[PDB]
Amino acid sequence: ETFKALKEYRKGQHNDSYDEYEVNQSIYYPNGGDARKFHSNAKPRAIQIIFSPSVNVRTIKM
Amino acid sequence: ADVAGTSNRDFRGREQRLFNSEQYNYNSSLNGEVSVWVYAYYSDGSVLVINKNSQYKVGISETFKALKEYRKGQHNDSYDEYEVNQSIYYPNGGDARKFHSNAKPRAIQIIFSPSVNVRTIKMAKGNAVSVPDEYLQRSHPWEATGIKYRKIKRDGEIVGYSHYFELPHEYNSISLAVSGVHKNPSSYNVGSAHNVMDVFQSCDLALRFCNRYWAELELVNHYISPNAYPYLDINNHSYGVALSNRQ
Amino acid sequence: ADVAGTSNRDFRGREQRLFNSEQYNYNSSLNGEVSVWVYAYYSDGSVLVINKNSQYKVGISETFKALKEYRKGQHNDSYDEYEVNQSIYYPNGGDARKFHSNAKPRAIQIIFSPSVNVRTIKMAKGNAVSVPDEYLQRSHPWEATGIKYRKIKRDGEIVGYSHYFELPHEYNSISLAVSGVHKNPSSYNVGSAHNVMDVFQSCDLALRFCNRYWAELELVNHYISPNAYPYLDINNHSYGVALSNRQ
Amino acid sequence: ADVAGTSNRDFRGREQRLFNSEQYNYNSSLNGEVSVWVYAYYSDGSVLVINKNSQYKVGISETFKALKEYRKGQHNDSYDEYEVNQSIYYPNGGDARKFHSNAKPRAIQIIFSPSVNVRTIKMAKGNAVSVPDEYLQRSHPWEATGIKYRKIKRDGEIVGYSHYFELPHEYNSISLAVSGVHKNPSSYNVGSAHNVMDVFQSCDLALRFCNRYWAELELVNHYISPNAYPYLDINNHSYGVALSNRQ
Ligand SMILES: Nc1nc2c(ncn2[C@@H]2O[C@H](COP(=O)(O)OP(=O)(O)OP(=O)(O)O)[C@@H](O)[C@H]2O)c(=O)[nH]1
Ligand SMILES: Nc1nc2c(ncn2[C@@H]2O[C@H](COP(=O)(O)OP(=O)(O)OP(=O)(O)O)[C@@H](O)[C@H]2O)c(=O)[nH]1
Ligand SMILES: Nc1nc2c(ncn2[C@@H]2O[C@H](COP(=O)(O)OP(=O)(O)OP(=O)(O)O)[C@@H](O)[C@H]2O)c(=O)[nH]1
Ligand SMILES: Nc1ncnc2c1ncn2[C@@H]1O[C@H](COP(=O)(O)OP(=O)(O)OP(=O)(O)O)[C@@H](O)[C@H]1O
Ligand SMILES: Nc1ncnc2c1ncn2[C@@H]1O[C@H](COP(=O)(O)OP(=O)(O)OP(=O)(O)O)[C@@H](O)[C@H]1O
Ligand SMILES: Nc1ncnc2c1ncn2[C@@H]1O[C@H](COP(=O)(O)OP(=O)(O)OP(=O)(O)O)[C@@H](O)[C@H]1O
Ligand SMILES: Nc1ccn([C@@H]2O[C@H](COP(=O)(O)OP(=O)(O)OP(=O)(O)O)[C@@H](O)[C@H]2O)c(=O)n1
Ligand SMILES: Nc1ccn([C@@H]2O[C@H](COP(=O)(O)OP(=O)(O)OP(=O)(O)O)[C@@H](O)[C@H]2O)c(=O)n1
Ligand SMILES: Nc1ccn([C@@H]2O[C@H](COP(=O)(O)OP(=O)(O)OP(=O)(O)O)[C@@H](O)[C@H]2O)c(=O)n1
Ligand SMILES: Nc1ccn([C@@H]2O[C@H](COP(=O)(O)OP(=O)(O)OP(=O)(O)O)[C@@H](O)[C@H]2O)c(=O)n1
Ligand SMILES: [Cl-]
Ligand SMILES: [Cl-]
Ligand SMILES: [Cl-]
Ligand SMILES: [Mg+2]
Ligand SMILES: [Mg+2]
Ligand SMILES: [Mg+2]
Ligand SMILES: [Mg+2]
Ligand SMILES: [Mg+2]
Ligand SMILES: [Mg+2]
Ligand SMILES: [Mg+2]
């Protein structure tokens, strides 16, 4: 998944989509965008990766 | 004329120093302002400041709601944020579509001007329904929190006082009032019969400011620094201007 | 150990009773809260509550407008309700599309906590333009209405005071302020020189709450009962918790 | 110590040169990335880039639709652009209100990193319904277009490969997939039994990027240059950083 695809998207509700385009331009390059926020709350705060017990843990790659 | 910076007759230097010292000591006379700021920090990096400036005593009181992020001119999920509030006022009382409102403050910094007597500072830190200590019946209307206030320092000088508390837990749902009394080292009570009605007029004359800034950098650059206010940023850096006996 | 509920040595029972009595009497000491609620009832079954909690004295003041129903996050005919207000402030002064705003309160209940002295209660019940008695010139700024306050009772105990008045007529268009002083049976004046500045700080430290609940049942279930507030519902039933000398 | 820039003992210089050469040769080892970019140029000056970065082999596949300009957060005539698509998929199949969608790409540049073997490059340049050569039955799924790829050069060094084709005619309506294999001068097949499952994992591990930049200048300034990517702008200027044996 891309940086964008991981950001919160609320189906059927408002998502500041124009400003969140601006936000992305400023994450892809310092001062590259014209957002109205310092931090997008749409950005993930944490990630958990889980595998099933059928995986060989020594084969996991990130 | 004597050369600059070489004698007791640099009258420009002596006036500069008196000009700064006069402003330090006027602030702290009974003629001067006492000022309080409450900063509500939101998870989006923005900062609501509420400032009140007034003579003798000053305070700020705000409801749980009034402290939540409000973005002027932009969408604020206002219907859902009504639902959200009903669920904060009573467990499972609302019908929101979120677990945590990002409009809720993550931290609060209370700052006072150096004209306050830190021993007079009182905080009413209530629950979401504006009750200081769980039930009204056993609530002392305030706590004297002055002992927790750190000195904001610049150049060896106290430029103000800071109390900072995070609200990082889901139950950190608050209403907030805070009060301080202007320094009075004299035995002239500013609220005794002779001057009490001037204090009632200071209640009316207290000037208020609030605004949401987009970032702490914007607060530092455009709120704090232009006005010579004290501040303590997230990295523990002190902002202010030391005035007492300096040029 | 002695068996529970059979001796003078049930120390769990004695502590329970002291715990409740301590909260009754702390409320009513000069250290405790005095609280006022104004309930605006709307024709749609909803109820605006405004609560203020503070030491020594407490009050609420609201304009004609601030008392009108406002539905957060939903449509409120705001343009027409501007027009409506102009016609309430002066006969035929506006251009509304309704005869009666359903946003206008149908009734008001004023409740005080049992820490109030009912003889200190004062009401400024103004006209729509905030004039207590027809013209400012002959207006006494208040009326001492304490004699009309019924005791809210639970188990033989006063859990608060209620004044209720309907606004069912087309001309019942009001602004409203109400004030009460915390019980002081002592001859220590809380606003004499020794303690006057603490009273000025209680003005700042007074905590406020308001919210519109959808129904009286929701007020009873989720505002009144969770917080141990007194209430008197439309069917004349008293809500509260009797604390003095009980388990 | 020896003076800088005068001897075989400038170890800072030798390390700088090794640091750059190590990055050139790591890219081109079987451990390194191979990267493809497709740039869709629109008549409004904007540029969609789709980048994929992965080990062993890399490619991008996009439908006719996915290549059309989409302006995040702004209006895109989406209903009419549905109608537009129906008329591109079949002559006179839709009910649009335009002859030519300005959302259609005017040109495409395909760039590969210098870790590709140009002889392994394959393009499936289909019609609007995703058929490479008029009908599926006589379609070879790809063309080996490597011979058309120009070297992007900086300082004498190949910083990547470019194939550029305009789409300036009304019938230049395309779907597009493009594929390249990482350089392997060895006789160790990266997809033989010993390493085949790592190649299946590189399919999952391939990282993707896309974004629409407002202008080629913004692509050059904020996409290409910050990341040390190769580029060839409209004026035939080569961008990249020469690394092999330089400081
Ligand atoms: N006091 C002091 N300041 C120094 C020294 N070295 C650099 N400084 C800088 O000089 C600034 C203040 O110097 P001055 O104002 O001229 O000295 P002062 O201590 O205020 O004494 P007076 O101005 O004569 O009353 C400080 O904020 C420092 O950043 C030093 O050794 N002593
Ligand atoms: N006082 C009283 N309560 C009764 C009686 N019958 C039923 N009750 C119930 O019992 C409740 C209170 O009883 P208790 O608290 O045990 O008695 P008390 O009058 O408070 O006396 P103490 O607890 O010993 O101080 C009331 O609220 C009633 O609902 C009765 O005959 N007398
Ligand atoms: N090679 C070369 N570069 C020149 C000359 N004149 C100016 N330059 C500039 O110098 C740059 C590279 O010079 P150097 O890197 O010091 O020389 P080099 O050819 O890389 O040789 P080494 O660094 O010793 O391995 C070029 O990109 C030119 O812009 C010249 O006559 N020969
Ligand atoms: N190098 C120095 N040696 C002695 N005194 C100094 C020196 N630098 C500054 N001072 C003086 O010592 C006093 C304290 O100044 P200083 O700037 O160190 O404190 P501050 O601004 O409150 O805290 P900080 O520098 O730790 O952020 C002032 O009178 C200042 O002019
Ligand atoms: N059956 C009873 N006989 C005698 N005393 C009772 C009885 N029931 C309750 N009491 C006691 O008499 C006092 C009055 O209690 P009670 O519940 O009747 O008043 P209340 O709650 O203020 O009013 P109400 O019951 O009319 O709504 C309390 O001490 C209570 O414990
Ligand atoms: N004036 C020069 N004389 C000789 N060699 C040079 C000169 N300038 C640069 N070089 C060297 O010759 C080689 C080719 O460098 P050059 O910059 O001319 O090629 P380029 O960047 O691929 O193409 P271009 O300059 O035409 O855009 C490099 O080793 C470079 O350092
Ligand atoms: N930096 C920004 C951010 C927003 N906007 C304006 O904000 C308006 C509405 O906000 P938007 O970012 O589009 O989000 P919403 O409309 O609130 O919700 P949604 O994601 O559904 O569009 C847009 O018309 C856009 O022009 C702007 O001019 N400049
Ligand atoms: N629990 C909720 C939350 C929201 N909504 C619907 O969400 C719609 C729009 O969301 P809203 O909460 O009103 O916020 P926005 O419209 O996105 O922005 P604003 O604060 O300006 O209204 C409203 O019509 C409301 O009916 C709802 O039905 N139930
Ligand atoms: N006497 C009136 C009353 C209403 N309107 C028109 O009614 C329209 C919409 O009604 P409004 O009073 O604004 O209420 P709503 O839009 O229904 O809801 P809200 O309070 O959110 O605006 C407004 O544009 C206003 O121009 C009017 O022209 N004259
Ligand atoms: N051939 C077409 C094209 C457009 N429309 C009407 O055009 C209206 C608005 O244009 P639309 O194509 O939806 O684009 P926009 O609304 O301008 O922008 P967006 O892509 O955000 O919807 C739509 O309601 C659609 O019914 C139509 O009836 N027939
Ligand atoms: Cl003074
Ligand atoms: Cl007391
Ligand atoms: Cl290798
Ligand atoms: Mg929707
Ligand atoms: Mg707006
Ligand atoms: Mg310093
Ligand atoms: Mg709404
Ligand atoms: Mg009873
Ligand atoms: Mg938008
Ligand atoms: Mg060159």
Q: Compute CA C242 distance to the chain's CA centroid, rounded to the nearest angstrom.
A: 19
- Residue B183 CA to ligand 11 center (angstroms) comes to 10
Instruction: Mark yes or no for CB contact D72/A21 under 8 Å.
Output: yes
Rg of chain C (C-alpha set): 21
* Inter-chain touch C73–B60, beta carbons under 8 Å: no
Cα end-to-end span (Å), chain C: 21
Query: Which stretch of DSSP H or E encloses residue B12?
Result: helix B11-28
Q: How many CB atoms lie within 10 A of CB D192?
A: 9
Adjacent-strand bridge partners of C211: C49
DSSP one-letter string for A1-62: --TTTTS---TTS---HHHHHHHHHHHHSTT-S--S-SS-TTS-S-------TTS-GGG---
From residue B170, how far is each of B56, B104, B128, B167, D178 by CA, in Å?
37, 10, 12, 8, 49
Count how many Cα atoms sit within 13 Å of the Cα of residue D217 in the half-sphere of its side chain: 1
Ligand 4 pocket mutation pick from B151, B155, B231, B233 by most atoms within 8 angstroms of CB: B155
B:C CB pairs within 8 Å: 137
User: Are C133 and C196 a contacting pair, CB within 8 Å?
Assistant: no
d(CA B212, CA C138): 44
Q: Kindly report the three-state secondary structure assignment for every residue of C86-107.
A: HHHHCCCCCCCCCCCCCCCCCE
Residue with tokens 């889901």: B170
C61, exposed or middle or buried, with CB in 10 Å at 0-12, 13-18, 19+?
Answer: middle
Cβ within 8 Å of residue C64, ≥6 positions away: C85, C88, C89, C128, C129, C130, C173, C174, C175
Q: What is the resolution of this structure in A?
A: 2.5
Chain-centre distance for alpha carbon B193: 29
Cα R_g (chain A), whole angstroms: 16
Radius of gyration of chain D (CA): 21
Task: Determine whether the shortest distance from the Cβ of A23 to ligand 7 is under 6 A.
Answer: no
Three-class SS state of B138: helix
Instruction: Give the separation between CA C118 and CA C148, rounded to whole angstroms.
Output: 10
Q: How many CB atoms lie within 10 A of CB B171?
A: 9
Contact B57 C202 (CB under 8 A): no
Question: How do strand B33-41 and strand B47-55 relate by DSSP bridges?
Answer: antiparallel
Distance between CA atoms of residues C51 and B89, nearest Å: 13
Which residues line ligand 5 at a C-beta cut-off of 6 Å? C 153-156
- Cβ of C39: how many Cβ atoms within 10 Å? 23
For residue D85, give the amino acid letter.
Answer: N
Which residue is listed with tokens 């430290």? C205
Q: Which of the other chains make 3 or more beta carbon contacts under 8 angstroms with chain C?
A: B
Residue of B nearest to A16 (CA): B75
Neighbours of D233 (CB within 10 A): 14
Backbone torsion region of residue B28, taken as left when φ is above 0, otherwise alpha when ψ lies between -120 and 50, otherwise beta: alpha
Contact B102 A41 (CB under 8 A): yes
- φ/ψ of C184, rounded to 5, equals -140, 90
Structure tokens at C202: 């209680």
How remote is the CA of residue D223 from the centroid of ligand 13, in Å? 29
**CA–CA distance from B192 to each of B181, B185, B187, B188 (Å)?**
14, 15, 11, 8
Contact between residue B178 and residue B155 where contact means Cβ atoms under 8 Å apart: no
Residue carrying structure tokens 């500013």: B190
Q: Do chains A and B touch (3 or more CB pairs under 8 A)?
A: yes
List the structure tokens of C121.
């209660």
Between vectors from CA C167 to CA C166 and to CA C171, what angle results, nearest 5°? 155
CA–CA separation, B42 vs B108, rounded Å?
9
The experimental technique used to determine this model is X-ray
Distance D25 CA to ligand 3 centre (A): 21
Residues 6+ apart with CB under 8 A from A19: A35, A36, A37, D73
Residue of chain D whose alpha carbon sits nearest to that of A26: D222
Q: Within its chain, how far is the Cα of B186 from the centroid? A: 25
Q: Which amino acid is at D44?
A: D
Atom of ligand 2 nearest to the CA of C155: 27
| Cβ proximity of C126 and C67 under 8 Å | no
Task: Give CA B19 to chain center in angstroms.
Answer: 26
As a whole number of angstroms, the distance between CA C210 and CA D152 comes to 67
- Give the whole-angstrom CA distance, residue B125 versus residue C207: 9
* Residues belonging to chain A: 62
Which helix H or strand E contains C218, and what residues bound it? helix C216-219
Cα–Cα dist C58/D64, whole Å: 70
Determine the Cα angle at C219 with ends C216 and C225, to 5°. Answer: 130
Residues 6+ apart with CB under 8 A from C34: C53, C54, C55, C56, C57, C58, C112, C113, C115, C116, C180, C181, C182, C183
Q: Which has the closest alpha carbon to B216: B76, B37, B39?
A: B39
What is the 8-class DSSP label of residue D226? H
Distances (CA, A) of D140 to A7, B124, D57, D123: 39, 77, 20, 10
- Contact (CB, 8 A) for D52 and D59: yes
Q: What is the DSSP letter of C2?
A: P
How many other C-beta atoms are found inside a 10 Å radius of the C-beta of residue A53? 5
**A35-to-A17, A44, B224, C132 alpha-carbon distances in Å:** 11, 18, 23, 51
Distances (CA, A) of B106 to A39, B133, B171, B173, C176: 13, 21, 11, 10, 36
CB of D114 within 8 A of CB of D238?
no
Q: Return the domain boundaries, chain C.
A: 1-247
CB contact under 8 A, D210 and A24: no
Q: Looking at the CA of B153, name the nearest ligand.
A: 4
The helix or strand, by DSSP H or E, that contains position C152, with its residue range, turns out to be: strand C150-154
Query: What percent of the residues of chain D are helix, what percent strand, and what percent coil, each to the nearest 5?
Result: 25, 30, 45
What atom of ligand 3 comes closest to residue D245's alpha carbon?
Answer: 25
List Cα–Cα distances, D36 to B74, B106, C148, D58, D130, in angstroms. 39, 43, 84, 7, 20
Q: Provide DSSP, C105-118.
A: -SEEEEEE-TTB-G
d(CA A30, nearest CA chain D) in Å: 9
Q: Is D161 annotated as a binding residue?
A: no
- Check whether D100 is labelled as a binding-site residue: no
- φ and ψ of D176, to 5 deg: -155, 125
- Contact at 8 Å (CB) between B58 and B36? yes
D221-D222-D226-D232 Cα dihedral, nearest 10 degrees: -50
Query: How far from the centroid of its chain's Cα atoms is residue B51's Cα?
Result: 6
Which among D188, D220, D236, D228 is positioned nearest to D24, based on CA atoms? D228
Residue A18: which of D74, D223, D226 has the nearest Cβ? Answer: D74
Q: Which ligand is the nearest neighbour of the Cα of B157?
A: 4
Q: Using a 6 Å CB cutoff, which residues line ligand 4?
A: B 153-156
Enumerate residues preceding breaks in chain C (C to N > 2.5 Å): none
Strands, E, within chain D: which ranges?
Answer: 33-41, 47-55, 57-62, 107-112, 122-126, 150-154, 157-166, 175-181, 207-213, 231-232, 238-239
End-to-end Cα distance, chain A = 12
Region for residue B188 given its phi and psi (left: phi exceeds 0; alpha: psi -120 to 50; beta: otherwise)? beta
C-alpha C74/C-alpha C96 separation (Å) is 20
Q: How far is B45 from chain A (nearest CA, A)?
A: 5
Query: What's the start-to-end Cα distance of chain D, in Å?
Result: 21
Closest CA to D191 of D61, D55, D60, D33: D55
Query: In this complex, which chains have at least 3 CB pairs below 8 Å with chain B?
Result: A, C
Question: How far apart, in Å, do the first and last CA atoms of chain B sit?
Answer: 21
Q: Which of B79, B81, B139 sits opposite C33 (nearest CB)?
A: B139
Radius of gyration of the CA atoms of chain B, in A: 21
Q: Is B14 in the pocket of ligand 1 (CB under 6 A)?
A: no
| DSSP three-state, residue B198 | helix
Distance (Å) from the alpha carbon of B26 to chain A's nearest alpha carbon:
38
Query: Hunting for tokens 């010139």 — which residue is that?
Result: C137
Q: Is residue C166 a contact partner of residue C106, using CB atoms and an 8 Å limit?
A: yes
Using an 8 Å Cβ cutoff, are D117 and D184 in contact? yes
3-state secondary structure D16-78: HHHHHHHHHHHHHCCCCEEEEEEEEECCCCCEEEEEEEEECEEEEEECCCCCCCCCCCCCCCH
Q: Which residues of D touch A24 (CB under 8 A)?
A: 211
